[PDB]
Design a protein around this nucleic acid. Structure first.
Ligand SMILES: [Cl-]
Ligand SMILES: [Mg+2]
Ligand SMILES: [Mg+2]
Ligand SMILES: [Mg+2]
Ligand SMILES: [Mg+2]
Ligand SMILES: [Mg+2]
Ligand SMILES: [Mg+2]
Ligand SMILES: [Mg+2]
Ligand SMILES: [Mg+2]
Ligand SMILES: [Mg+2]
Ligand SMILES: [Mg+2]
Lengths: 244, 43, 118, 218
RNA sequence: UUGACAUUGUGAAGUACUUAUUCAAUGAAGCGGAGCUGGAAUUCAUUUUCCACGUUCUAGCAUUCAAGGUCCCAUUCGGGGCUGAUCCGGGUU
RNA sequence: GCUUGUGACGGCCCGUGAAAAUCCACAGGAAGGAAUAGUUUUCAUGCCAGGUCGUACUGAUAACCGCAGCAGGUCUCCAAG
RNA sequence: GAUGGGGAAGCUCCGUUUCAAAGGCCUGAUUUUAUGCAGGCCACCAUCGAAAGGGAAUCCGGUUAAGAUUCCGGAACCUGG
């Protein structure tokens, strides 16, 4: 046979992300002396749309501690944040929506978003619209914090990792039906080349493991083991169970 | 803009040609009141 | 220890000496590759070109492909002792360059053309 | 005085821009600088075998100064002094000079001719000189590990020497040599047996030392 | 993918360390230890310990080795130390 | 009325619809500066120079590509009653 | 798509600011001579990529067998100095 569709994506020729209109990478401030000891005040200058991203972005300007200039950061806006609001980031910041604090400086049950997996990686968890992280406990010994992730998993994270108080804005987006192929077209036009999708059973055997036959049918179990090689992993990979 | 006189490119006021009159008015009032408020916080 | 206000280390400035070769590169300088006699090759004496002499006060020359308008103006003044108002040039379809040289009102192109020999 | 005012600046977090401070502790040094500093650290963090660890002990300042004072009386003749001697020429007296050269000195020790051997502690290929203390101990020739291969070189008109030895000394300096040998023997030759059993290194870093001391206390 | 050997060292008991190796960030800016100042604090002779130690009504402003204080120059238009801004270790974190 | 330019508005998106060179203004106050004298070339007038390469013509049922002076193919502006 | 670096027996491959000591214009100092030498500023760190994107500045009349917003006449404008 020939190289199947899912194998061709790794070469990254026509399957790269469309990033012309992106506002920039959304990250927290670099963890510096002001953050880990006190707090620093920023101001929300504007809230803008980002192509390919459901959640809006906020531009926050801080003063440079060591130079006379202004440094602009791109944050993922939370619900309630407005233009002209003062944002406080650091260990000694207050418990308010939009503030950035270490996970060990907030009580149990606090709702946070854009949470760092490790202290200083500038946000990895709960970034999509309408998502958040719930803090469920603290372990002052070994300096660890236990949280609940949007997928439902429980993770143990360092207490020095930072997070933004609140919930990512733009929630409820997926409740609206797309209702037509045209809206799906424009959605992925700003993301990547992955739409539309041709079913494997509609192809020939040279093209896909599901191809061929005088009827359209898979012909063998679609549950594929974790140990299969590239060109075989098509269908349900390492499925623990199937059915409704 | 490099071929015209400075008169065409500014207004005789602080921040003339950069910020409008109402925005300049807001800056002056905000600057005065906040600085007065800082004194009463000090004592 | 010195006081370093910046955490960045830069390459220090060190003395650079000018070249003092022990033998010349070529030992014989080349003569002027574009003198007046090489810039101006020959006048153009077509019927159209001659009409520009007595009417437009313009002299037409074939010039070297390597000569620009500065060199053409200088060559004409030195070879013919005249003043040049402006120079217009073009590259002909046969691969040669033609220059339209207009003299100032203080000179007559027809008198200069007769003195040259055409 | 009526026109000047005192306006202290606030350098706290969120206040005025920080002033220029000494950041030498944080300088991103070139690659060659870092490797030579970390080479020193790595050699002391690990346990040093006794054969190499014996070179950490060098002659003290007072006795080393007297050692070089005696050796400076037996400098080899320079090229300028060589020219005058040659044009005069057994018309010349017997010379007295410091013996140098690794191959030359090793042969002298093996033939029981060196009365005092100086050993440099800065030889980067340490194997060149690592066997000398044992060889001198076996042959009964006193030795001293002295600090500075450059300093040994300057007494033999060389950039570096890495070794020096005296084989024959003048009569007027016999007493001085015997006084130095006794002092030198008590530091290196007499302690060879115990030093050979002791490992070096194992020193912790500044921050690691504080962490260990804190755990030991509480 | 699983095992063995090499990379591959150090200490303890029936896991611990750092230096190799690995990951990440920063135009390697504030790390570690200690000392000041105060608070909590109960003392069982004195501090056996722990915290903090310039910034939160407001879409302003924050840059000229810093003004002030003090010590020098040989007074000129200025210049240079210390302090302001606590010490020690050069392990960037 | 036609073509086109433009202004103030309105509808639409899980689509909100380039970048850089380049030019200007402002904040700031380092310096330079008057009395027998100076600064402004962002006011007016006056002086000098502006190189190199392309430029003809066809642009199609005959000048391009299809073996050709081939009913095929080949991007675009102007548009009378 | 070079450099610094890391791959590959090798032709060469990766990568484009990357584990690099990566660079030069405002002057002050000098009237021995041309720039050695005092502060500070700035760290962005090759280059290529549009005759429809961005972009300093020209118009009218006349003139040839064939040239013109390019020549002639008149009238303007921009940039650098
Ligand atoms: Cl396919
Ligand atoms: Mg089919
Ligand atoms: Mg198949
Ligand atoms: Mg199969
Ligand atoms: Mg031309
Ligand atoms: Mg034409
Ligand atoms: Mg053809
Ligand atoms: Mg053909
Ligand atoms: Mg390449
Ligand atoms: Mg280009
Ligand atoms: Mg024509």
């Amino acid at each position: 046979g020939r190289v199947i569709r899912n194998q061709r994506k790794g070469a990254g020729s026509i399957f790269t992300s469309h990033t012309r209109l992106r506002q920039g990478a959304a990250k927290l401030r670099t963890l510096d002396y002001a953050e880990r000891h006190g707090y620093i005040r920023g101001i929300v200058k504007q809230i803008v749309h980002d192509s390919g991203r459901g959640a809006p972005l906020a531009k926050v300007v801080f003063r440079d501690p060591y130079k006379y200039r202004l440094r602009e950061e791109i944050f993922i806006a939370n619900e309630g944040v407005h233009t002209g609001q003062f944002i406080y980031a650091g260990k000694k910041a207050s418990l308010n929506v939009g503030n950035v604090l270490p996970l060990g400086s907030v009580p149990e049950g606090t709702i946070v978003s854009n949470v760092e997996e490790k202290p200083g990686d500038r946000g990895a968890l709960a970034r999509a619209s309408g998502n958040y992280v719930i803090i469920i406990g603290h372990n002052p010994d070994e300096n660890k914090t236990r949280v609940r992730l949007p997928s439902g998993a429980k993770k143990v994270i360092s207490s020095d990792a930072r997070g933004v108080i609140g919930v990512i804005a733009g929630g409820g987006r997926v409740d609206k039906p797309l209702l037509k192929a045209g809206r799906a077209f424009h959605k992925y036009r700003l993301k990547r080349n992955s739409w539309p999708k041709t079913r494997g059973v509609a192809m020939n055997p040279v093209d896909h493991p599901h191809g061929g036959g005088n009827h359209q049918h898979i012909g063998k179990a679609s549950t594929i083991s974790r140990g299969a090689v590239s060109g075989q992993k098509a269908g349900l990979i390492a499925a623990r169970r199937t059915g409704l | 803009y490099a071929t015209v006189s400075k008169t065409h490119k500014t207004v005789s006021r602080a921040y003339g040609g950069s910020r409008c009159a109402n925005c300049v008015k807001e800056r002056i009032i905000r600057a005065f009141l906040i600085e007065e408020q800082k004194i009463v916080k000090k004592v | 220890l010195k006081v370093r206000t910046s955490a960045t280390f830069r390459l220090p400035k060190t003395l650079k000496l000018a070249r003092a070769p022990k033998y010349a590169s070529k030992a014989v300088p080349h003569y002027n590759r574009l003198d007046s006699y090489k810039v101006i090759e020959q006048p153009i004496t077509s019927e159209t070109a001659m009409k520009k002499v007595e009417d437009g006060n313009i002299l037409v020359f074939q010039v070297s492909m390597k000569a620009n308008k500065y060199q053409i103006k200088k060559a004409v003044k030195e070879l013919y002792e005249v003043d040049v108002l402006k120079v217009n040039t073009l590259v002909r379809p046969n691969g040669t360059k033609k220059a339209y040289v207009r003299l100032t009102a203080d000179y007559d192109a027809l008198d200069i053309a007769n003195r040259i020999g055409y | 005085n009526p026109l000047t005012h005192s306006t202290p600046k606030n350098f706290g977090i969120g206040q005025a821009v920080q002033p220029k401070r000494n950041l030498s502790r944080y300088v991103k040094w070139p690659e060659y600088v870092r490797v030579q500093r970390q080479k020193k650290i790595l050699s002391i963090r690990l346990k040093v075998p006794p054969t190499i660890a014996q070179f950490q002990y060098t002659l003290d300042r007072n006795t080393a100064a007297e050692t070089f004072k005696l050796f400076n009386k037996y400098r080899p003749e320079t090229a300028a002094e060589k020219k005058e001697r040659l044009t005069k020429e057994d018309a010349s007296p017997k010379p007295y000079a410091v013996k140098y050269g690794l191959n030359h000195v090793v042969a002298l020790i093996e033939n029981k001719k060196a009365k005092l051997v100086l050993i440099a502690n800065d030889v980067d290929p340490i194997e060149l000189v690592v066997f000398l203390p044992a060889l001198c101990k076996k042959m009964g020739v006193p030795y001293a590990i002295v600090k500075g291969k450059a300093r040994l070189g300057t007494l033999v008109n060389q950039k570096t020497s890495a070794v020096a030895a005296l084989t024959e000394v003048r009569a007027e300096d016999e007493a001085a040599l015997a006084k130095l040998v006794s002092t030198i023997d008590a530091n290196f030759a007499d302690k060879y047996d115990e030093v050979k059993k002791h490992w070096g290194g194992g020193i912790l870093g500044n921050k690691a030392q504080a962490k260990m001391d804190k755990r030991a206390k509480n």
